Amino acid sequence: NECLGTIGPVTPLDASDFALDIRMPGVTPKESDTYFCMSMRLPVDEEAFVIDFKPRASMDTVHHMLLFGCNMPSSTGSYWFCDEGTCTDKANILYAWARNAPPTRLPKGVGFRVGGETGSKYFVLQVHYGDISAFRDNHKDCSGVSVHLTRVPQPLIAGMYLMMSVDTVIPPGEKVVNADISCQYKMYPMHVFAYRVHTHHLGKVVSGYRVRNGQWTLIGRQNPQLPQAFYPVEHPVDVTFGDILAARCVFTGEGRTEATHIGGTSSDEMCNLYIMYYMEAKYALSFMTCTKNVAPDMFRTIPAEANIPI
């Protein structure tokens, strides 16, 4: 979508609301599959709430876009290759836009808390230029996301529960390697409303579940090779103190002449399940993470769908 020019990136929507456009600074990808990053300091220092997102993506070149909240972008520059890093501190994903899998809106009354003393001070945008054909014109690109921010406190707060493997090793040619992740939930109840799966080329299926008294409730199941957008859940699933979140990524080593471990490059793998949730404002925490596997055995009871592709 058009570069903003003279009007700037901030549009007053009303006294309490305003839209902030986060766009690439007129960039021109010179190689296919370029990952460019840029940051935007929040205009206000006080706490605000992000209540909507509107993509401004060029349907041709842009493969996917991710918007994160953090306090220390990886670079002080205008833009930079994301392979340099997104955020020095923890990058809290807030939005993902995938080319052929349109994003779902946040439920109304739900917002991510930013700014203030504890929320993100910056937004970091990542734009993945896949096919850079339409860039021979050597035209500058300003794709991005328009965020709707409000100072009006939201009754439900959005957060992210990230389950990620750190130790997986996929022997070469190995037909099937599983990456199990599990943790006991120890906070106030959260309600999952969307999920996103992330894996590199060896990923076949990624599934996540709430396990309560031994029964498995599907949160989300997706083939990570399909566009990695946040997909809505079939039905809202509350996760409560006492429950255990379980996730499994099914990989294959076929095609690889060497072992593949967890890592950031395409020759490495990742097993990430982003579980987007909402919590009552007074009980809400913005992010939780599980990088462990506390109930290995429990996986003997994982639904068969978790192993069969989709």
Binding-site residues for Cu(2+), in ranges, read 63-64, 128, 198, 200, 270
C-beta of 120 vs 228, nearer to Cu ion: 228
Please indicate whether residue 64 is annotated as part of the active site.
Answer: yes
C-beta of 174 vs 238, nearer to Ni ion: 238
- Alpha-carbon span 289 to 271, nearest angstrom: 13
The three-point CA angle 268-273-276 to 5° equals 145
- Tell me if 268 contacts Ni ion by CB under 5 A: no
C-beta of 17 vs 238, nearer to Ni ion: 238
Q: Which does 64 bind (CB under 5 to 8 A by kind): Cu ion, Ni ion, none?
A: Cu ion
- Tell me if 189 contacts Ni ion by CB under 5 A: no
SS3 301: helix
Q: Which of 211, 189, 65, 178 is nearest to 127 (CA)?
A: 65
Min dist CB 285 to Ni ion, Å, is 18
Whether the CB-CB separation of 253 and 260 falls below 8 Å is answered with yes
Please indicate whether residue 191 is annotated as part of the active site.
Answer: no
Whether the CB-CB separation of 148 and 53 falls below 8 Å is answered with yes
Greatest distance between any 2 Cα atoms in the chain = 60
Min dist CB 275 to Ni ion, Å, is 15
Q: Which does 196 bind (CB under 5 to 8 A by kind): Ni ion, Cu ion, none?
A: none
- Alpha-carbon span 137 to 140, nearest angstrom: 9
Min dist CB 269 to Cu ion, Å, is 8
Please indicate whether residue 215 is annotated as part of the active site.
Answer: no
Q: Which does 210 bind (CB under 5 to 8 A by kind): Ni ion, Cu ion, none?
A: none
121 secondary structure, DSSP code: S
CA of 149: how far to CAs of 154, 192, 258, in Å? 11, 22, 47
Q: Which of 121, 128, 248, 256 binds Cu ion (CB under 5 A)?
A: 128
Please indicate whether residue 270 is annotated as part of the active site.
Answer: yes
SS3 84: helix
- Tell me if 238 contacts Ni ion by CB under 5 A: yes
User: What amino acid positions are annotated as catalytic residues?
Assistant: 63-64, 126, 128, 198, 200, 270
